[PDB]
Every structure is written in C-alpha cells, then in structure tokens.
Amino acid sequence: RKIDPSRGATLGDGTPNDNDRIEIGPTQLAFSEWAAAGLQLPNLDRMREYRWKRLTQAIVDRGYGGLLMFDPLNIRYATDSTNMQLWNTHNPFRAVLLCADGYMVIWDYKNSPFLSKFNPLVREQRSGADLFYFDRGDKVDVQADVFANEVRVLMQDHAPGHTRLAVDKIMLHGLRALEAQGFEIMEGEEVTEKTRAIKGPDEILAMRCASHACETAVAEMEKFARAHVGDGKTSEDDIWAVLHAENIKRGGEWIETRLLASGPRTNPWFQECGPRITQKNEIIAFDTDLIGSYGICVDISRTWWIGDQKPRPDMVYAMQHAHEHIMTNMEMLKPGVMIPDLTANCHRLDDKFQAQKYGCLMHGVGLCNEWPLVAYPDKAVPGSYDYPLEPGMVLCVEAAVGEVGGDFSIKLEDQVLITEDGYENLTTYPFDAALMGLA
Amino acid sequence: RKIDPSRGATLGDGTPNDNDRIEIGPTQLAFSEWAAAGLQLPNLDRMREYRWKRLTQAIVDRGYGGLLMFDPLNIRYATDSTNMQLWNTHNPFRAVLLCADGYMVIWDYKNSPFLSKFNPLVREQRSGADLFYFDRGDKVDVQADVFANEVRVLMQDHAPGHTRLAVDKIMLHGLRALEAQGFEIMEGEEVTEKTRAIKGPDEILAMRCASHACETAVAEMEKFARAHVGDGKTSEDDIWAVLHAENIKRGGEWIETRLLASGPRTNPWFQECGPRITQKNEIIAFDTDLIGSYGICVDISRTWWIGDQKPRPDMVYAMQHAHEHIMTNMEMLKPGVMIPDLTANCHRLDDKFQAQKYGCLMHGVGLCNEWPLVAYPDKAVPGSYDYPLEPGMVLCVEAAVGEVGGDFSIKLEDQVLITEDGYENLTTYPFDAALMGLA
Lengths: 439, 439
Ligand SMILES: [Fe+3]
Ligand SMILES: [Fe+3]
Ligand SMILES: [Fe+3]
Ligand SMILES: [Fe+3]
Prior knowledge:
Chain A is of the alpha+beta class. Chain A has 2 domains: 1-199, Creatine Amidinohydrolase, Chain A, domain 1 (3-Layer(aba) Sandwich), CATH 3.40.350.10; 200-439, Alpha-Beta Complex (Creatine Amidinohydrolase). In chain A, 35% of the residues lie in helices and 17% in strands. Chain A is built from 13 helices and 17 strands. In chain A, the strands form 4 sheets. Chain A has a 6-stranded mixed β-sheet, sandwiched between helices. Chain A has a 5-stranded antiparallel β-sheet with strand order 14-13-15-16-17. A 3-stranded antiparallel β-sheet of chain A has the order 7-10-11, covered by helices on one side. In chain A, β15 and β16 form a beta hairpin. The longest helix of chain A is centred in the middle third of the chain and has 28 residues, at 201-228. Chains A and B meet through α4, α5, α7, α8 and α10 of A and α4, α5, α7, α8 and α10 of B. The structure holds fe (iii) ion (4 copies). The site of one fe (iii) ion has 3 residues of chain B, from loops.
C-alpha cells in the first residue's frame, strides 16, 4: 500500500505514504530528484496552516467579516485543494468562505465533496455555489438566493455584527443575491494579493522544489531542441511539448501561456508557440509560465542560439544588455525598498529597445503571477503600489530586448526571493554561452 | 518561405502558407494525419464570419445594443484570436465589444495588439480593459472609468439609443463603472451559450479534425499504458503526460481537468490524476476534457483493463451497463426533442449505480463544455432548459457506473452531432474488448 517502500507511515512532506490515497502531489520521480539534490521538503500541514492563519489575519486587519473566493487560485491558497483547476478558471462552480474567526467552508462540485477533506481547516463541504448559465440555465437566480442565504447565516454565526464581505470575483447573479442579503461587497483581490505576497518557510521550501523540477524540465527541452532543431520537421510545438510532459511527469499542473517562439517570430514578443518549422542558426526564446510541482509557479525565461554558425554581434549585444538589465534591477531588491523606487531607479535600456520593452521590470510570483507589478517609469501610475518590499516576497525580474522591426528579441527572466537583509536568486538555469559572448 | 512546400499561397484551411506567420494553428503533423484520414478541412475565414454574424444576430434579436466579453472562451468564439488563454481565464486583461451593427473592438494586452489583426472583422485593437488588482493595484478605479467611457462612446456610435449591454463576466470595478455610464447590464452568458450551441458547417469540419487528432493522441496514450502499466514505476501522471504532449504536437491547446485514475482511485469518480503507481490487473478510466486542434473541445471518456487475468464479472457487467446507458440515451437525439424530455426518458441505471451516477447524462460542447446541461430526473430543475435540440448542436453523452464503497468505476462518453434527421456519433474510439465481455 506504500508508494515509497523506503519510508514509514508518512512521506517526506508529512503526507500519507499510501499509493491509493485521494490526495495527489509530486511524483516519485520528482521526490527522487529532489532528494538527490539535497532539497528539504515542505511540511504541507504547516504550510496550509500558515496560509490559513495569514488570510484570516488579513480579513481581521481590514475590519471585514469575511472573504468569499471564486478564483481557483485563491481557493488553492486558502485550502490547498484542487479540483479541475483549469475548468474552474472559466467555470465558477466552486467557492470558499473564510470568516473573521477563521471558520472556513467550501462549496464544491456536487459529485466531489471528498476532494478537500484532507485539509481539516476546511470545516464543511457543501455544494450549490455554481451560478452560471451552462450549469443552471434559466434558473441561476433561484440558487443564487439559496447560496447567498447560506453565506448570510454563516456570517451571522461566525462574524456577527459584520456587514463587510470581501469577494474576489463573482457572477452578477451572485453579486446581487449577496447585496440583497445586506452585505457591503469589498475588493477581495486587495486582500488575497497582499496576503499571498509573503511566503512562509514551507512555501519557500515548496517553491525551491518546484523551481528545481522546472529547471530539470527545461533542461530536457533544451536537449531535445539542440538535438533536432533544423531537421526540416521539428516545430515550435514539438519542442514545447517536452516542457508540458516533463512538468506533468513531476506532478506539475499546467502552463499559463504559449510564450515560446523561434526566429523572426520572437520579434515582436508575445507571438505564440505554433506550427513553425524551426531552423538552424536561429534564436529560440521562451517563458516557462509554469504551474509546477506542489502547484507553485516557476516563471523564468531564457533565449537560445542553436546552429553551426556564431550568432550575430547584435544578438550578443542584446543578450548581454538584457542580462545586465535583470542583474542590475535584481540588485535593487531588499526589505524596506518602496516599489515605486524600484521603478524610479531601474536600469536604463538603450533607446532602440525602449519601444518594445516588457510590460513590467518585475512582478510577484507564487501560485501564479501575483502582486506587485513593478512598471517601467513611462507606464507607472502614481499611488498604485505605494508599499515596501518585505522578506518572503518572491519577485520575477524581467528583460525583453529587441528593436522595432528587428528580426529577433531576447527574453530573460529570473525568480528572486526577498530575504531578511537582501535577496537570493532562486534561478540557477544557465545563460546561453554563445549569446553571452563567452563562447 | 512556405511551411508546406506542396501547396500554393494558402494551406487547406485558407490561411497563409507561411512558415513565419504570426497566426498559429494545426501543425504539419496534424494536417498530414487529417489528409491521410480523408478529412475535409474547415475554411477559417468562413467559420469566423459565420460566428460573428450569428453572434451579432443574437444581440439584435434580444434588442440589446452590444455584448461585452471577458471570458477568453467567448473572446475565442467572437474573434478566433488567442492570447495566453489559460492566464486569461483567471486574469481578465482582455475584452471584446460587439455592437448591434456588427462593429467589433478588442482591448488586448498592451504589448500585443497584433494578435487579432489576422481577423479583419475585429475593427480596432485597443488596450486598457485590464481591471484587476495585480495589473493595476490601488488604481483600478481610474482605468475602469476610462474603459467604461470608451464603451459608452462606441455604443453611442454603433448602437445609438441602446442602453442594454450584455456582459458575460466582469470585475466589480468594471461593473460599477459601466452602470455609472448609464448601461443596464444584461446576462451575457445567455447570449453566448445559445449562440455557440449551433455550429456552422466550418465549425463542424474543425471539430471532425479535432476529434481525429484527439483520438490519435489517446491511441498513443493507450499504447504507452498497455506497454508500461505494472512495471513498478509507471504512474498515472506518466500515462497522462502522453496525452498532453501528443495534443500539443498536433496544435492542441490545453486539458481542462485531471480526470484520469487507476484502480481503486476510480471510485468515487473525480479523484485526480496523480503519482499513484499503476498495477497490473487493474482498471484505468479517463476523460479527455481536451481543448485540441483549431481550439475545439473533444470530450470523450474510456475505461481500460490492463492485466494478465480477466476483468471481474461485476466489472464486465458495469462496462456493458455503461455502454448500454449512452447508446440508449444517444438514440433519443434528433431535432425538435425538448431537453427536459431527454431527462424524462433517459435509460435507467440499476439501483446500485444510482447514488454515484454522473452530474449529467448529456452536455453541449464546442470550444469547451457548453450549454445545455441535461440532468438526470432526480437533479433536473423545471424551467431551466426548456428548449428543443436543433441541427448543428453537439452533445456529449455520459456514463458513470459504480457502486457506493466499490473499488472501481466505469466512465464512458461519446461526442454526438445533431443532424437534420437525427444524430451522428463523431466518436470512433474503440471500447475495451475484455471489459465488454469479448476476446
Ligand atoms: Fe512570464
Ligand atoms: Fe514573467
Ligand atoms: Fe468530460
Ligand atoms: Fe463531458
């Protein structure tokens, strides 16, 4: 019945050593690689408790009575329970209520109430929070009233006297039913984003594991790419598919974008991974945007030169410039620095790269891309992110470098932890030596 | 430079024969398999025109002035343009406005206005519809008002006199800003679900292609499973990873669920694909829930026996019962049948299988799971889906068969087109011979 014969009743992360358990997670492949790498495993119970305590405190601090979550990523933060995450993202069938006294209720898919029972912090498993046309047709409104009354009763019993209810995102039928029950609806994302921005110690351990699994997956992809780019039939999709499979093999969950592109399709950036047949002596650039092991997002970007010739000198300069961009901007990071000061003091890209530079120079990361967004000075809005960095924040540091009308771009990105007195770059993946001008 | 040297200026679906184009789509591998299989390809231009005309007409019929879409799946329907779909599903950065005169505008990611330029029906590419805390922090409200005013001006110019604006789903700041501009917000999903439910000729062609690619990919996964299950290390995730890769290799897009499970993890159903090490002489059941080539959803389910020994007799019976369930229910399908009569006349499962039967016996499908939902008699809600089937609808037909406390379940499902005179089962994938009671 054990999935790992070499261990006792529990796995290294404290979960049941049971091949037949309901709960999923990292595979034996991932665990094996992490152990060989000397990575400490998170304790999931302590992690779940940390997140829950923190989210409750956030509600209390704002003087709210509760927080109601329909975003699958917020539900994942609150409960660590998944259920058809990707379907859930555009079908709001699921909901979690967390009250000011810490009492937490989930409304799950009717047929699957068992999916969150591994987490005892989830005190109740209900159903009927699915308020959208596919699931209920012309009778959404009736159930919206049933649900909103349930939320009223829960709030009466667990947040008496509170009328402020924070909601991340809710269908209009739901919004109106809640307001009909006398709730003042507050901005749920302001609560969830600032809570999720600070990782506890187990989250950081989990993230270290996911990063390692991601870098392993990327290394398989680079091996495949260098092995058969230019063979006349290997597509962008063929290469990218390796990342998909190696992620899933290690217990990863999905990939957020299609940001892999070859040759002239790298400029302008944001062209999507497709059928293009790759060529010898061309750039390939990509962004992992990966929801990986333990559901942790690993967001890094690399640019490869593949071929028998040397890359052009303008390619080497661009690569070196981008690398300088993220290493300079990274060095600004430490606790107490104000986010708009990052914007104001950031490394200056050459004029010819300014037009097509990235949408931010940094952003938060956790279970996916997260607050804060650190804009370049010409896009930054005063009063949008007037907050200081704190230990436990994790920021991805970005560079997109390419000219208007040019035939290539560089994309680089590392994932960086804020520590007690500075920063630690979590990303160890190599930079292409030819593009760096070192080979 | 051509991606397919055997063709002229265009590919079989009318798109440019250009290896370097922005637009993505099916790979040469997919096109090659479809040509081998005898499949007529969709014409994408005609398909895009059919959807747009139909969506515009839907607005006109209801007496609305416009329809505003933040669901990436509805955006896909209206424009056929993708952009970080999965990120978009839980980060509403994107919007499409379609007015009563057919005028259509997209607000896209700031850095990527070019992604919808291939569709001349999209008349403008703007930015600034991203109304959520990650993207704008404490200054969502300012841009919400800028966006809402833009919508007002467009509606004044292209739907003068109309104050009814259908919206599928929008963040509260956006909702408030639009209402402040005088709009009465109508249920957008009621419009999009009913429009999307009838597929044009080209959408049916695209779906035939997607179905074949999906079945091909599943064939690879079956090969992998039968060759490796029970080798002491092959996990659920290992098997499932094959479907991911093979889908991506054919220009597919993502998978909506984690519904693949082995052995006792199939009962109860909806346990998720994970690290479980698979065993010889065991059931593996799965649900593709796949967003495939041309962005079309293929939603089929099969159950497999892998082992030396024979399946148990109760397994074989359950499989037969399940297969009987869907084939009987499928026979109800033809134009003019009222959905609640599908419910009332459905095949009855044995008492022992009733408690855990699926959440529906049928549902629509197109770009993903869509309206209608056909519930079993004990869950159906009167007045929820009082509409007749029509030619061009596509419905998946479902069976979940398992006992309370049982150690396996059967899951079967086929994807069926409604024709002028009846139905056409689009799904050709075989049923497990041993489970069916053959040899
Ligand atoms: Fe990214
Ligand atoms: Fe990033
Ligand atoms: Fe399904
Ligand atoms: Fe289905």
